PDB file of all heavy atoms in Angstrom:
ATOM      1  N   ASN E  26     -41.499  69.650   5.437  1.00 81.44           N
ATOM      2  CA  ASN E  26     -40.775  69.690   6.644  1.00 81.44           C
ATOM      3  C   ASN E  26     -39.351  69.489   6.629  1.00 81.44           C
ATOM      4  O   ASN E  26     -38.493  70.231   7.129  1.00 81.44           O
ATOM      5  CB  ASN E  26     -41.475  68.692   7.583  1.00 81.44           C
ATOM      6  CG  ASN E  26     -42.943  68.947   7.853  1.00 81.44           C
ATOM      7  OD1 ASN E  26     -43.361  69.984   8.198  1.00 81.44           O
ATOM      8  ND2 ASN E  26     -43.692  67.880   7.806  1.00 81.44           N
ATOM      9  N   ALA E  27     -38.988  68.444   5.798  1.00 81.91           N
ATOM     10  CA  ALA E  27     -37.539  68.178   5.598  1.00 81.91           C
ATOM     11  C   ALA E  27     -36.812  69.371   5.017  1.00 81.91           C
ATOM     12  O   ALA E  27     -35.718  69.688   5.371  1.00 81.91           O
ATOM     13  CB  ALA E  27     -37.376  66.859   4.837  1.00 81.91           C
ATOM     14  N   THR E  28     -37.360  69.867   3.876  1.00 80.83           N
ATOM     15  CA  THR E  28     -36.642  71.018   3.288  1.00 80.83           C
ATOM     16  C   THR E  28     -36.613  72.252   4.166  1.00 80.83           C
ATOM     17  O   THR E  28     -35.510  72.827   4.201  1.00 80.83           O
ATOM     18  CB  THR E  28     -37.469  71.439   1.937  1.00 80.83           C
ATOM     19  OG1 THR E  28     -37.592  70.221   1.100  1.00 80.83           O
ATOM     20  CG2 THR E  28     -36.876  72.523   1.289  1.00 80.83           C
ATOM     21  N   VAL E  29     -37.583  72.527   4.772  1.00 81.97           N
ATOM     22  CA  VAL E  29     -37.700  73.787   5.660  1.00 81.97           C
ATOM     23  C   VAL E  29     -36.649  73.618   6.745  1.00 81.97           C
ATOM     24  O   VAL E  29     -35.771  74.446   7.052  1.00 81.97           O
ATOM     25  CB  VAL E  29     -39.069  74.089   6.266  1.00 81.97           C
ATOM     26  CG1 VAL E  29     -38.944  74.935   7.433  1.00 81.97           C
ATOM     27  CG2 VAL E  29     -40.055  74.524   5.156  1.00 81.97           C
ATOM     28  N   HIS E  30     -36.631  72.436   7.482  1.00 82.03           N
ATOM     29  CA  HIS E  30     -35.603  72.328   8.655  1.00 82.03           C
ATOM     30  C   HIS E  30     -34.314  72.109   8.211  1.00 82.03           C
ATOM     31  O   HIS E  30     -33.363  72.516   8.910  1.00 82.03           O
ATOM     32  CB  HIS E  30     -36.162  71.201   9.496  1.00 82.03           C
ATOM     33  CG  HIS E  30     -37.388  71.582  10.310  1.00 82.03           C
ATOM     34  ND1 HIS E  30     -38.503  70.710  10.447  1.00 82.03           N
ATOM     35  CD2 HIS E  30     -37.682  72.652  10.925  1.00 82.03           C
ATOM     36  CE1 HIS E  30     -39.412  71.312  11.134  1.00 82.03           C
ATOM     37  NE2 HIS E  30     -38.941  72.433  11.509  1.00 82.03           N
ATOM     38  N   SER E  31     -34.014  71.406   6.975  1.00 79.48           N
ATOM     39  CA  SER E  31     -32.741  71.467   6.416  1.00 79.48           C
ATOM     40  C   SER E  31     -32.190  72.871   6.098  1.00 79.48           C
ATOM     41  O   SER E  31     -31.019  73.104   6.416  1.00 79.48           O
ATOM     42  CB  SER E  31     -32.604  70.611   5.198  1.00 79.48           C
ATOM     43  OG  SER E  31     -33.156  69.379   5.371  1.00 79.48           O
ATOM     44  N   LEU E  32     -33.007  73.722   5.595  1.00 80.70           N
ATOM     45  CA  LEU E  32     -32.591  75.072   5.206  1.00 80.70           C
ATOM     46  C   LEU E  32     -32.310  75.856   6.515  1.00 80.70           C
ATOM     47  O   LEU E  32     -31.403  76.564   6.618  1.00 80.70           O
ATOM     48  CB  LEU E  32     -33.632  75.900   4.383  1.00 80.70           C
ATOM     49  CG  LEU E  32     -33.804  75.377   3.004  1.00 80.70           C
ATOM     50  CD1 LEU E  32     -35.147  75.629   2.421  1.00 80.70           C
ATOM     51  CD2 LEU E  32     -32.748  75.955   2.179  1.00 80.70           C
ATOM     52  N   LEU E  33     -33.060  75.569   7.575  1.00 82.73           N
ATOM     53  CA  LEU E  33     -32.874  76.216   8.851  1.00 82.73           C
ATOM     54  C   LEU E  33     -31.553  75.843   9.436  1.00 82.73           C
ATOM     55  O   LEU E  33     -30.847  76.663  10.034  1.00 82.73           O
ATOM     56  CB  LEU E  33     -34.013  75.918   9.796  1.00 82.73           C
ATOM     57  CG  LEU E  33     -35.316  76.737   9.461  1.00 82.73           C
ATOM     58  CD1 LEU E  33     -36.410  76.401  10.654  1.00 82.73           C
ATOM     59  CD2 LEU E  33     -35.112  78.133   9.364  1.00 82.73           C
ATOM     60  N   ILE E  34     -31.220  74.526   9.313  1.00 80.48           N
ATOM     61  CA  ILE E  34     -29.969  73.908   9.825  1.00 80.48           C
ATOM     62  C   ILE E  34     -28.814  74.661   9.127  1.00 80.48           C
ATOM     63  O   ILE E  34     -27.710  74.909   9.728  1.00 80.48           O
ATOM     64  CB  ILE E  34     -29.910  72.395   9.622  1.00 80.48           C
ATOM     65  CG1 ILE E  34     -30.804  71.678  10.745  1.00 80.48           C
ATOM     66  CG2 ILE E  34     -28.426  71.966   9.779  1.00 80.48           C
ATOM     67  CD1 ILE E  34     -30.485  70.254  10.834  1.00 80.48           C
ATOM     68  N   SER E  35     -28.947  74.838   7.898  1.00 79.29           N
ATOM     69  CA  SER E  35     -27.842  75.480   7.039  1.00 79.29           C
ATOM     70  C   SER E  35     -27.551  76.982   7.479  1.00 79.29           C
ATOM     71  O   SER E  35     -26.425  77.390   7.614  1.00 79.29           O
ATOM     72  CB  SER E  35     -28.284  75.653   5.624  1.00 79.29           C
ATOM     73  OG  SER E  35     -27.248  76.224   4.797  1.00 79.29           O
ATOM     74  N   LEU E  36     -28.625  77.635   7.893  1.00 78.71           N
ATOM     75  CA  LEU E  36     -28.393  79.050   8.552  1.00 78.71           C
ATOM     76  C   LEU E  36     -27.632  79.035   9.756  1.00 78.71           C
ATOM     77  O   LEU E  36     -26.737  79.826  10.099  1.00 78.71           O
ATOM     78  CB  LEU E  36     -29.737  79.667   8.849  1.00 78.71           C
ATOM     79  CG  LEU E  36     -29.871  81.145   9.156  1.00 78.71           C
ATOM     80  CD1 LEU E  36     -29.318  81.930   8.054  1.00 78.71           C
ATOM     81  CD2 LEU E  36     -31.294  81.571   9.378  1.00 78.71           C
ATOM     82  N   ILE E  37     -27.813  77.958  10.572  1.00 76.44           N
ATOM     83  CA  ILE E  37     -27.023  77.819  11.869  1.00 76.44           C
ATOM     84  C   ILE E  37     -25.658  77.429  11.660  1.00 76.44           C
ATOM     85  O   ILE E  37     -24.709  77.849  12.446  1.00 76.44           O
ATOM     86  CB  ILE E  37     -27.846  76.520  12.747  1.00 76.44           C
ATOM     87  CG1 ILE E  37     -29.111  76.820  13.024  1.00 76.44           C
ATOM     88  CG2 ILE E  37     -26.952  76.266  14.040  1.00 76.44           C
ATOM     89  CD1 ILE E  37     -29.411  78.224  13.682  1.00 76.44           C
ATOM     90  N   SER E  38     -25.381  76.676  10.523  1.00 77.95           N
ATOM     91  CA  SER E  38     -24.028  76.286  10.092  1.00 77.95           C
ATOM     92  C   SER E  38     -23.203  77.552   9.706  1.00 77.95           C
ATOM     93  O   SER E  38     -21.931  77.404   9.669  1.00 77.95           O
ATOM     94  CB  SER E  38     -24.091  75.087   9.129  1.00 77.95           C
ATOM     95  OG  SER E  38     -24.600  75.630   7.914  1.00 77.95           O
ATOM     96  N   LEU E  39     -23.735  78.592   9.258  1.00 77.88           N
ATOM     97  CA  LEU E  39     -23.191  79.823   8.738  1.00 77.88           C
ATOM     98  C   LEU E  39     -22.329  80.463   9.746  1.00 77.88           C
ATOM     99  O   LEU E  39     -21.229  81.091   9.540  1.00 77.88           O
ATOM    100  CB  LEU E  39     -24.280  80.877   8.314  1.00 77.88           C
ATOM    101  CG  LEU E  39     -23.917  81.564   6.905  1.00 77.88           C
ATOM    102  CD1 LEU E  39     -23.624  80.473   5.953  1.00 77.88           C
ATOM    103  CD2 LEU E  39     -25.216  82.376   6.553  1.00 77.88           C
ATOM    104  N   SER E  40     -22.569  80.369  11.077  1.00 75.49           N
ATOM    105  CA  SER E  40     -21.839  80.968  12.204  1.00 75.49           C
ATOM    106  C   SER E  40     -20.437  80.387  12.224  1.00 75.49           C
ATOM    107  O   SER E  40     -19.524  81.131  12.678  1.00 75.49           O
ATOM    108  CB  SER E  40     -22.605  80.690  13.510  1.00 75.49           C
ATOM    109  OG  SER E  40     -22.431  79.335  13.835  1.00 75.49           O
ATOM    110  N   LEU E  41     -20.156  79.218  11.888  1.00 75.06           N
ATOM    111  CA  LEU E  41     -18.883  78.472  11.906  1.00 75.06           C
ATOM    112  C   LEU E  41     -17.845  79.129  10.902  1.00 75.06           C
ATOM    113  O   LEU E  41     -16.564  78.956  11.128  1.00 75.06           O
ATOM    114  CB  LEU E  41     -19.087  76.951  11.434  1.00 75.06           C
ATOM    115  CG  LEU E  41     -19.780  76.113  12.475  1.00 75.06           C
ATOM    116  CD1 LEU E  41     -19.784  74.645  11.895  1.00 75.06           C
ATOM    117  CD2 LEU E  41     -19.242  76.121  13.849  1.00 75.06           C
ATOM    118  N   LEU E  42     -18.297  79.845   9.906  1.00 76.14           N
ATOM    119  CA  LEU E  42     -17.395  80.521   8.890  1.00 76.14           C
ATOM    120  C   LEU E  42     -16.597  81.533   9.388  1.00 76.14           C
ATOM    121  O   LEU E  42     -15.475  81.801   8.771  1.00 76.14           O
ATOM    122  CB  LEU E  42     -18.389  81.005   7.859  1.00 76.14           C
ATOM    123  CG  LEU E  42     -18.785  80.089   6.618  1.00 76.14           C
ATOM    124  CD1 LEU E  42     -19.619  80.828   5.534  1.00 76.14           C
ATOM    125  CD2 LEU E  42     -17.457  79.480   5.997  1.00 76.14           C
TER     126      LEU E  42
END
Side-chain angles (χ1 to χ4, degrees):
Chain E
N26 301 309
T28 303
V29 165
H30 288 133
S31 303
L32 290 155
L33 286 187
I34 284 195
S35 180
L36 191 60
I37 300 310
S38 69
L39 224 54
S40 73
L41 296 180
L42 275 183

